[PDB]
From a paper:
To obtain a homogenous sample for structural analysis, we expressed human ATAD1 lacking the first 40 amino acids (consisting of the transmembrane helix) with an N-terminal His-tag and bearing a commonly used ‘Walker B’ mutation that inactivates ATP hydrolysis but retains ATP binding (Δ40-ATAD1E193Q). Δ40-ATAD1E193Q formed oligomers as assessed by size exclusion chromatography. 3D classification of the particles resulted in two distinct hexameric structures. Refinement of this structure resulted in a map with an average resolution of 3.7 Å. In the next step of translocation, M6 continues to move upward, assuming the M1 position (top position) in the open spiral, detaching fully from M5, which now becomes the new M6, occupying the bottom position. Consequently, the angle between the two subdomains of M5 widens, and the subunit resumes its original conformation as it reaches the M6 position. The side chain density was clearly visible, and we modeled the peptide as a 10-mer polyalanine.
The mitochondrial AAA (ATPase Associated with diverse cellular Activities) protein ATAD1 (in humans; Msp1 in yeast) removes mislocalized membrane proteins, as well as stuck import substrates from the mitochondrial outer membrane, facilitating their re-insertion into their cognate organelles and maintaining mitochondria’s protein import capacity. ATAD1 is a member of a large family of proteins called the AAA (ATPase Associated with diverse cellular Activities) proteins. Six ATAD1 subunits rotate and translocate progressively to form a hexameric spiral assembly. Each ATAD1 subunit consists of two subdomains, a large subdomain followed by a small subdomain, and the nucleotide is bound at the interface between the two.
Numbering used by the authors:
A (entry chain B): 43 to 315, 328 to 351
B (entry chain C): 43 to 317, 328 to 351
C (entry chain E): 46 to 314, 328 to 351
D (entry chain D): 46 to 315, 328 to 351
E (entry chain F): 69 to 112, 128 to 197, 210 to 220, 230 to 316, 328 to 351
F (entry chain A): 69 to 317, 328 to 351
Write the structure that this text describes.
């Protein structure tokens, strides 16, 4: 009688299941365990507005994912007006991919679940395959839901003969149960995949996500917008030309700008020990971050 | 008394096997555990008509692998004219591999069973080999049946030193029970599988499936045909130059063309949902550009 | 209950194979169920073609110690081997030879089916492994067969279950150790696709090794002529011609090629093969043989 | 399984560190064995010289949010920086700065010891790495120190063991993934000797970046002053004079040369201070030995 | 011997069953002549490692009963049972039996392969235990100590190969002037069990020839050499 | 010492099993003298220097130079005449296929280092074991190297455990950057010169018979670029002629066979060129 950590995690999984609010569906062992990673929508504090700079991609994702979910009774007659199985957001590191994912987990219904591949792989034999199958069994049992695989470039890597038989069979069972013999028809089971290097993801799984949204490094206008958002609620001195700094931070990403502004606010509060930012601390922060960014060279 | 979850699998498999329709065959513990995976033909909504673009392959599969199951009155005389003990489909990912088997499950009127390799593996000691045995036992028990294994290569990979003793033992038991000592009398049992990396399948299991079908990457004409297939029920209007749009999408596979058409239809319905309109080759040709930009991402 | 089915099956088969009543208490009885009936499988030496010298050598070296044993009783060294191994490329007669031997060799044949040896319960595996050799000498002469011996008896390593590694020493000690190899005539023959990782110890217990090469031109011609025997093949067909073009082809591959030709002929629904449908099939396989490449 | 003795050992350690009661199932317990008690450390801010701007910025950025936290709960933008790392040439302070932060910042600083994560059994390493963040948020405010993070989290390449890729991917995901990045206050810090091939995403994961450099002329005089405070240095020994001769040397090799020159006074006794001459001879010999390699 | 000591004595092989003697160990007489002064002399562990075959279990079978007093072989399978892990009891009862018949040598074939009962056996550890294994690589750390003497039964060399070969043809008819030294020179990597099969194939070459009663004129020896050479080249 | 510490202690060399002493170390006597004051002396008078903070023994000593000339010898000598139980690491006996093993085996080494103080460690062919850090290599190798470095510098200062790692390399040109820093007290055991030939022939000829009138300066002059091991290897060719002269029937070498040997070894030395 080994592998009895399922009851301890199962207590919390049932607690969270009751918290979210579901019908009397009863998971047995493995999907019951995977239910532990279910994320409550209220916990997420990020809405659609918090994602700034890029709105075309946001509108596309909305109209192509959430719209099929809502008023689904108007699209079943059409054979191919259902949400695609697999949406993957790609691009350079950062730039709000995980932010978009967190936003979707709240303002989309479609009870959200994070996979966290670590939980799948297990020590005992023939125990990780059970979890891999339970993932989709759950996705279709408490339907409708969305699955998230953070950093999907490593877990579902490009298949090779060198990988362990267990992990290879795991990523093959994923493919089989995704759109295989018995699932394709209609289950509104859509996986959402974050990726910083989509080239090494796969060739088959690359197609299993027909919808790929590019998340590029913020440009001039995008940078200005994302910085305007960050300083929306914070206090700054008057007549601060926000656009002017966009040129100074030519190649900065979203998080780089966030840190640039945060370090300036911290410099202000340190000078206190409650002072409006005079935009000179911002320039000093840009100059200081330019050196740290040029770490490799 | 451990591993008593066989009660739920027993109930499920018994109900499914009674639904599919069979005689009072006796299956006790493990054949029952595997019987839970039987796929009922009525559930499948795809047929030979839904599969298009490839006709020669479809005709060859309809004549060589299924007609022997139908024309049993003609092959009891000839020993060399029995059906092949295994046929596999290989090629690039997509374009009907997992769909041809879905159509077969319905059309061939067999006792199609989806193996789902995951069910074979078990944490307890020795259960994997016994389930591997029960698989073929049931197969011969309710012949004529077809066993399907999606991603055969990932499951039945090349034999190496770095594999668990149970997995290798079960993989060798498959080889021994499929065509080894006691088999191939008639048994009408054919094991087919689908894969996209056939080169790493095995040194000899490839021979265990002598007949193999290659699903070519969609070329121009079959691409146009499969696209016209999808564009028959929708509200697509006339004067759509199907040939040109099909020629534009060169490297596209079948699922990629399906996604392109779906995205074009959704773009078209955006206009209505904002406030029911034909796709007059413009939104289609423009969504082709979006799908092209989306494809050129691994570089 | 497992033991009830064991009772039925092993009592039916043991009595059907014509062995005088012996006491197979619990586990020897359980393994007796795997006994193969000499009548069921029907593959004679004539079915084996191409490799005539190898099959003759096997026939002699294995049967003559068993049959005509009276001539060999006075000798202490000329007795049936305590181990045989038939390796080589896949297919091409290995399990075919194994099947044929089980019929025209006497020496009641018992397949091992390694799967049955494993058991989740404690102690069942080792007890079954011992009961195998117990039964083998209980009803001698007997042949033991382990298909894909390389996988079952894989190279000993650290990454193996304690019971699967205990049965290794069990087998090794009971095969030719302290209480065997006197007057038992228990020959253990095995077949394997890959001889690389068989063993270092078990490899020694199977000294006699008959290697069945990939059928060459003449052996390919012979094996191909063999298959086209019952069906209505059209005369004037040059088997040597197709043999020339089937260089890389294997035995089972040629079997499937003939099957495809015959099924193509039947598609024209009662025609004899006139070497043109054979050409179609061989062209198809030459185009497709490089499935990996 | 060896986690029974590991739990027994980590018991005395965790409870010894003045903790709030928490239950650790199996893995967070295994990682708790790496806690470093503040009293065990014997390094403070005063033990560091030559770089006062860098350590002042370090405190201003990391300790100012931690300490006097009652002034930042009203603002969502002023939180401690996640992933503060200190790069630069080998030696000269990095690990010593980490120890100083560990001792003089409280917040139950913990070392990672990346070797403990690797395990032969399948699924062990991936599930163990999550226990790190689990314990960290369990007993926050905490610090996770990836010593020599250059090797642990390298630039992701196509060819790598299935274990390491999943390991670093789960690291990045648990860092700032779906359910994280709030007032938990967890702050990782790494001390790499080479920032060339650390990562592309992990680099962004670390916004704050400190530059520990080879001590300059003034910094070298400062560290030389600090070195011989406990020792009885001679009178009229110009530390600035020897700082010039020791141009390229870093801090550690300078401490070495100092110990070597000091041992000579003992050699002459086996007990007088160093009158600026033994220092010169020792630094000459050490320069020759350093340039002897090439 | 109430319950378990009887279960163990059930494996008590008899001296009359043994069929080996010192002459049967041909060529490897130096190791067994060094033995007596080492082991047989004290009475009137001991582990024998080496390559697969070539006298290990042969040397174990010889001196087992003809020398010593009523020794017993364990064959660890005897320990593991179906019920709730009673092995420990047996593991103890075994040594109990050992004190009954002072002395009785204990044999453990393939000791390398041979949970809690394992530690109990290690702990309980009069006679010197004899453990024969094909690989001393990873036998154990604690077990290796209890066995201080380790006789390396090496792969027979040229002279040793010829010595072991001449024994196989002692009571079997062969041709005169057969160069045993030459055939031994031919076989380089052969073991004793392999020379056995080679000479047996050579003799069968004559038996069959008669079947279709004759000495071996070294032609069948050469044929068996050429055949077993390819036979050995299986893994490679 | 549960599992790994025992695996490493299995390499513990016994002091009495080393037949080398300082009297058997010639040609460079300044090096062994510096060894006394820089390394042995801290270990000596330990009751004296506990008060001194920065005068404790060193951690990491490196002896580089072209092959031979005593790189290998002094090590065992340092273990014999100074106590301080010594262990050779056998760098090749570290790596294994099993995942996560090498890391634990290595950590066990530095554990053995401290729980058996005062313990020296010797890393032969450190270049081979700890080759220059490279961006492109087996992740396991770089991980092991970084773990070794961290545990070396990790929690050793202020502990006064007296662990003095020592590494020898034929070429220090591309050893490392940080690892080289880890071994500060580099000892330049260097190719000796004409003066050393006498020293090397002394220890070898003292036991056997060699007639007088054999000018040591002559054997030093006939060869100028020979190493420490090369001079011993050359004396072999000469001694063998004299030894053989009797077998074809116990004689001293009258400075002549040395000439033939030096000539033959000059010819052989001219092999690559
Ligand atoms: N458009 C935006 N508006 C506001 N903040 C942003 C935006 N884009 C990025 N950020 C900042 O970046 C951080 C999120 O980083 P992000 O989720 O993009 O990392 P990531 O690269 O997606 O992670 P991973 O590598 O695991 O995919 C947040 O703290 C947020 O403040
Ligand atoms: N000829 C076709 N007609 C209609 N749809 C098609 C065709 N070929 C592919 N598709 C589309 O592709 C999808 C099925 O993908 P497919 O079965 O080809 O993947 P696969 O490569 O078989 O997967 P696996 O790698 O598991 O074998 C379906 O949704 C279907 O709409
Ligand atoms: N010499 C032959 N004569 C007739 N048929 C042959 C011959 N060799 C192979 N075959 C064909 O090959 C099939 C048998 O394959 P075979 O028994 O050689 O597989 P195997 O390689 O022994 O199996 P495994 O790989 O498990 O050892 C039969 O259907 C038979 O028609
Ligand atoms: N500013 C300083 N003040 C006092 N000691 C110093 C200073 N800089 C360097 N040292 C000396 O250097 C040694 C510490 O080395 P350091 O921590 O710089 O190694 P490191 O190269 O940072 O390690 P890693 O390679 O893992 O980053 C101490 O013994 C200390 O005496
Ligand atoms: N010196 C010898 N004289 C005669 N026969 C020998 C000799 N050495 C080996 N043999 C032959 O080898 C066979 C015995 O093999 P052996 O007892 O060496 O196996 P083993 O290696 O002990 O088994 P395990 O590997 O299980 O320990 C006998 O049949 C015998 O004929
Ligand atoms: N400069 C020297 N330092 C130490 N030993 C020397 C020196 N010159 C000659 N020797 C003698 O040479 C012997 C060691 O030979 P060595 O040069 O180490 O050969 P190898 O390099 O092949 O090991 C020692 O016994 C030592 O007495
Ligand atoms: Mg992210
Ligand atoms: Mg598919
Ligand atoms: Mg076979
Ligand atoms: Mg440091
Ligand atoms: Mg033996």
């Amino acid at each position: 009688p080994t592998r009895k950590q399922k009851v301890e995690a199962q207590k919390q999984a049932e607690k969270l299941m009751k918290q979210i609010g579901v019908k009397n569906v009863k998971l047995s062992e493995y999907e019951m365990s995977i239910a532990a990673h279910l994320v409550d929508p209220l916990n997420m504090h990020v809405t659609w507005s918090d994602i700034a700079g890029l709105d075309d991609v946001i509108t596309d994702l909305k109209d192509t994912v959430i719209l099929p979910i809502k008023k689904k009774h108007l699209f079943e007659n059409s054979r191919l007006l259902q949400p695609p199985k697999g949406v993957l957001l790609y691009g350079p590191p950062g730039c709000g991919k995980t932010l978009i994912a967190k936003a979707t987990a709240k303002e989309a219904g479609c009870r959200f679940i994070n996979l966290q591949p670590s939980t799948l792989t297990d020590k005992w034999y023939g125990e990780s395959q059970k979890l891999a199958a339970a993932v989709f069994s759950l996705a279709i049992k408490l339907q409708p839901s969305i699955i998230f695989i953070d950093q999907i470039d490593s877990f579902l890597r490009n298949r090779s003969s060198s990988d362990h038989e267990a992990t290879a069979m795991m990523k093959a069972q994923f493919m089989s149960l995704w759109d295989g013999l018995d699932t394709d028809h209609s289950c509104q089971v859509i996986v959402m995949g974050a990726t910083n290097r989509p080239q090494d993801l796969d060739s088959a799984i690359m197609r299993r996500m027909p919808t790929r949204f590019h998340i590029n490094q913020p440009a001039l206008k995008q940078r200005e917008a994302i910085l305007k958002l960050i300083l929306k609620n914070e206090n700054v001195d008057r007549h601060v030309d926000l656009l002017e700094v966009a040129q100074e931070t030519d190649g900065f990403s979203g998080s780089d700008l966030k840190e640039m502004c945060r370090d300036a606010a911290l410099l202000c509060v340190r000078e206190y020990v409650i002072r409006p930012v005079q935009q000179q601390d911002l320039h000093r922060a840009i100059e200081k971050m330019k050196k740290s960014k040029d770490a490799a060279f």
